[PDB]
């Protein structure tokens, strides 16, 4: 960076020189009228070139050399080391007229060199390198560069209800571990010359996206000063001489969203005092950029950590069977004593090179009771648009990593259910959709859920890993598979086999395979629902790059309501608890053949050959009947992907 500093006619110029720049210096304007030639002297640590019409020539500390005065003959002035108290750094120019070799005038430039660098960890290793030349840019990918910031959305101490970033204060040094480091490094003499100050600042726009703290250690203990952030746009830095560092800690306050890309900037400037009533002149400015880390969902293929379960205290079979299942694994079971754990919350995570933690997304209106140390919270509330069943998080899921026609999605793709574009049907609120899209690294896909009364993708589809491989299966509800199976059992002499055996509230109904197969309107409804499933099958195959070999169909059956929307006839087996090879599967209560449920045996026959272990879990017996509704919920918290989100290269927006 070249900077203009002119000698001044009949006076001496004093200037601060910032290392990493160089000066071009006009000596002509300061020459007396009628002066012919000039010479120069300079000190040891100042390098001086005389530049004539672009041609540069190095000059000694004291020579006698003279050059013709011309507007096109100038100096280039460079310094490679900061000034100390022992320094006198200067360039002096002598002027001469045509008569005589004694100078008729002198103009000079007295310099104080300092180093100023605002440094961050741009190379993403967790340590703050000195002046990364890429620190002012942010690039995606394995070779990409630039610093990363976490939204500090967890809560360090329980005393306050709100997340850490909702205020301007830091109470606890544990909070600093969530924050990115930024160091202002300087080198120079005991003080800045008269008329200069160093100032850190941010734009008004970024002031609700960040906060920046400095740690002081006064007499009675450590304290945390908020120097940039909400309603503080600048901070005058206290300068210390010699080689010095000021350590700052930076927190993000906001996730990327509609209208906010996630990028924020922080600046430091050296300012020069001109006079009262006149603005200070930025002499030098250094900038760093941060990208705020996106919220990321976890697919069923990722290792389970904790199984969260909600049910009534007296549903004993459910609790017993869920505990049994989890005991086969290394997971924690967490129980709360009705679908809210599935519908109101989605467990995501955030990650930066220095730290990461799980973060809950809260569905639009006691889930804020999950907020705690290294467990974060985020929510979006529609300001205008009304919430529908499609805003519930049974309608929010995510695929395993996929490659679709050469395009890699290393974090998978978010899936949310919707209605056809021209249908006038339900759709998840724009505010939530906009939020998921803005995270960018999960590239969301809309499926068709609005044929279902509740309207959730988890009613019809799920993913499971294939044990001992890197692969996975798509599981789809299928009415055609159910009808095929029941027609086979009927042919085999089982048509009088009864559904829902043991649910006392259903006994008067006596539902049999025969009764199901002879219900003509139910057949037509389910043919239509199969068309709805197949439409989804096609979009999943297209957008996930799946073939028929990647899909397994589980028998399912639905009843139609007055809106021509589907609800489960028997419990939907596809929405299941997936812990690696072990699957909690809702107990279907299907027709008994030889004292085994034919739906259970059929499902085992599909899954077991692949090394999957099935446990059927009964949530409905405590209610004595099944009306299409589920009274329990589970949500599995999983380990984050090994792949770092910042190594992705998302498509241009």
Q: Does 1 participate in binding its own copies (rule CB under 8 A)?
A: yes
Q: Report, in Å, the least distance between residue 239 CB and its own copies.
A: 17
Q: Does 420 participate in binding its own copies (rule CB under 8 A)?
A: yes
Q: Report, in Å, the least distance between residue 33 CB and its own copies.
A: 4
- Report which secondary-structure segment, H or E, holds 38: strand 37-42
CB of 200 or CB of 454, closer to its own copies: 200
**Adjacency order of strands within the sheet including 582-586:** 577-579, 582-586, 613-617
In angstroms, rounded to a whole number, what is the distance separating the alpha carbons of residues 371 and 349? 13
Which of 49-57, 145-153, 175-183, 303-311 is the region at the interface with its own copies (rule: CB under 8 A)?
49-57
- Report which secondary-structure segment, H or E, holds 119: strand 105-120
Q: For residue 532, indicate whether it is catalytic.
A: no
The answer to whether 314 touches 622, Cβ cutoff 8 Å, is yes
Q: Does 127 participate in binding Ca ion (rule CB under 5 A)?
A: yes
Report 325-344 residues binding its own copies (CB under 8 A).
none
Report 260-299 residues binding its own copies (CB under 8 A).
261, 267, 269, 271, 274-275, 277-282
Q: How far apart, in Å, are the Cα atoms of 456 and each of 392, 453, 459, 532, 603?
A: 8, 9, 6, 13, 22
Q: Is 521 exposed, middle or buried (0-12, 13-18, 19+ CB in 10 A)?
A: exposed
Which listed residue (175, 450, 459, 600) binds Ca ion by CB under 5 A? 175
Q: Give the pairing type, strands 263-272 and 281-292.
A: antiparallel
CB of 279 or CB of 366, closer to its own copies: 279
Residue 196's closest CA among 112, 107, 77, 286? 112
CB of 308 or CB of 451, closer to its own copies: 451
Which listed residue (437, 541, 604, 631) binds its own copies by CB under 8 A? 541
In angstroms, rounded to a whole number, what is the distance separating the alpha carbons of residues 463 and 544? 12
Q: How many CB atoms lie within 10 A of CB 303?
A: 15
Q: Does 547 participate in binding its own copies (rule CB under 8 A)?
A: yes
Residue 141's closest CA among 642, 639, 643, 653? 643
* Binder of residue 54, out of its own copies, Ca ion, none (CB less than 5 to 8 A by kind): its own copies
**H helix runs in 106-259, sequence order:** none
- Output the CA torsion sign for 109, 115, 117, 121: positive
Q: How many CB atoms lie within 10 A of CB 64?
A: 9
Q: Does 142 participate in binding its own copies (rule CB under 8 A)?
A: no
What DSSP line would sit under 356-423, residue for residue? Answer: EEEEEEEPP--GGGG-BTTBEEEE---SSSPP-GGGSGGGEEEPPPEEETTEEETT--EEEEE--TTT
- Report which secondary-structure segment, H or E, holds 306: strand 304-310
Q: Does 481 participate in binding its own copies (rule CB under 8 A)?
A: yes
* Binder of residue 178, out of Ca ion, its own copies, none (CB less than 5 to 8 A by kind): Ca ion
Q: Report, in Å, the least distance between residue 537 CB and its own copies.
A: 6
Report 183-242 residues binding its own copies (CB under 8 A).
199, 201, 203, 233-234
Which listed residue (129, 327, 381, 538) binds its own copies by CB under 8 A? 538
In angstroms, rounded to a whole number, what is the distance separating the alpha carbons of residues 72 and 26? 9
Q: Does 413 participate in binding its own copies (rule CB under 8 A)?
A: no
Radius of gyration of the chain from Cα atoms? 35
Which of 111-119, 175-183, 460-468, 526-534 is the region at the interface with its own copies (rule: CB under 8 A)?
526-534
Report 381-420 residues binding Ca ion (CB under 5 A).
393, 396
Q: Does 178 participate in binding Ca ion (rule CB under 5 A)?
A: yes
Report 241-260 residues binding its own copies (CB under 8 A).
259
Residues known to be catalytic: 632
Residues that bind Ca ion (CB under 5 A): 121, 123, 125, 127, 129, 152, 154, 164, 167, 175, 178, 374, 393, 396
Residues that bind its own copies (CB under 8 A): 1-4, 6, 8-9, 24, 26, 28-29, 33-34, 51, 53-54, 71, 74, 199, 201, 203, 233-234, 259, 261, 267, 269, 271, 274-275, 277-282, 419-425, 480-481, 483-484, 487-488, 490-491, 527-528, 530-531, 534-535, 537-538, 541-542, 547-549, 553, 564, 652-653
């Amino acid at each position: 960076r070249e900077r203009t500093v002119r000698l001044q006619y009949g006076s001496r110029v004093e200037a601060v020189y910032v290392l990493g720049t160089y000066l071009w210096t006009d000596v002509y304007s300061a020459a007396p009228a009628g002066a012919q030639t000039f010479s120069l002297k300079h000190s040891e640590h100042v390098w001086v070139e005389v530049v004539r019409d672009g041609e540069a020539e190095e000059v000694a500390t004291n020579g006698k050399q003279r050059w013709l005065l011309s507007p096109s003959t100038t100096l280039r002035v460079t310094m490679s080391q900061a000034s100390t108290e022992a320094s006198s750094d200067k360039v002096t120019v002598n002027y001469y007229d045509e008569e005589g070799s004694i100078p008729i005038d002198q103009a000079g430039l007295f310099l104080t060199a300092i180093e100023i660098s605002l440094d961050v960890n741009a190379d993403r290793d967790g340590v703050v390198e000195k002046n990364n030349p890429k620190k002012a840019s942010w690039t995606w990918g394995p070779e990409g560069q630039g610093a990363i910031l976490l939204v500090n959305c967890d809560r360090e101490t329980p005393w306050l209800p709100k997340e850490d970033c909702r205020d301007e204060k830091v109470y606890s040094k544990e909070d600093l571990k969530d924050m990115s480091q930024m160091i202002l490094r300087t080198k120079g003499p005991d003080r800045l010359p008269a008329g200069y100050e160093i100032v850190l600042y941010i734009s008004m726009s970024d002031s609700d996206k960040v906060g920046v703290f400095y740690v002081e250690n006064p007499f009675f203990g450590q304290r945390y000063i908020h120097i940039l952030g909400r309603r503080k746009l600048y901070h005058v830095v206290k300068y210390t001489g010699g080689s010095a560092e000021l350590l700052f800690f930076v927190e993000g306050l906001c996730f990327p969203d509609e209208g906010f890309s996630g990028l924020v900037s922080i600046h430091v400037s050296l300012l020069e005092y001109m006079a009262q009533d006149i603005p200070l002149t930025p002499i030098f400015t250094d900038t760093v950029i941060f990208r705020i880390a996106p919220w990321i969902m976890t697919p069923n293929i990722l290792p389970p950590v904790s199984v969260f379960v909600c049910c009534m205290k007296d549903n004993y079979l459910f609790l017993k069977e869920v505990k049994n299942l989890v005991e086969k694994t290394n997971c924690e079971l967490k129980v709360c004593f009705d679908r809210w754990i599935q519908d109101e919350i989605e467990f995501g995570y955030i990650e930066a090179p220095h730290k990461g933690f799980p973060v809950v997304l809260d569905s639009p209106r006691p889930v804020k009771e999950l907020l705690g140390p290294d467990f974060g919270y985020v929510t979006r509330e529609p300001l205008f648009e009304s919430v529908t069943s499609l805003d519930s998080f049974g309608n929010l899921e995510v695929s395993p990593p996929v490659t679709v026609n050469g395009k890699t999605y290393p974090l998978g793709r978010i899936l949310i259910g919707s209605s056809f574009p021209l249908s006038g049907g339900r759709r998840m609120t724009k505010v939530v959709r906009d939020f998921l899209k803005a995270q960018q690294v999960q590239a969301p896909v809309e499926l068709y859920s609005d044929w279902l009364t509740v309207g959730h993708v988890d009613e019809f589809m799920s993913f499971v890993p294939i044990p001992g491989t890197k692969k996975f299966l798509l599981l789809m509800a299928s009415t055609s598979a159910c009808y095929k199976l029941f027609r086979e059992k009927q042919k085999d002499g089982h048509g009088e086999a009864i559904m829902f055996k043991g649910l006392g509230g259903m006994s008067s109904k006596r539902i049999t395979i025969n009764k199901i197969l002879s219900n003509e309107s139910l057949v037509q409804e389910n043919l239509y629902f199969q068309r709805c499933l197949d439409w989804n099958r096609d979009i999943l195959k297209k957008e996930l790059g799946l073939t028929e070999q990647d899909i397994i169909d589980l028998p399912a059956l639905f009843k139609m309501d007055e809106d021509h929307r589907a609800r489960a006839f028997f419990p939907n087996m596809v929405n299941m608890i997936v812990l690696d090879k072990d699957l909690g599967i809702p107990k279907p209560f299907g027709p008994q053949v030889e004292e085994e449920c034919c739906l259970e045996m059929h499902v085992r026959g599909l899954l077991e050959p692949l090394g999957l272990e099935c446990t059927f879990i009964d949530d409905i017996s405590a209610y004595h009947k099944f009306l299409g509704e589920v009274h329990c919920g589970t949500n599995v918290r999983r380990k984050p992907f090994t792949f770092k989100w910042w190594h992705m290269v998302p498509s241009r927006r």
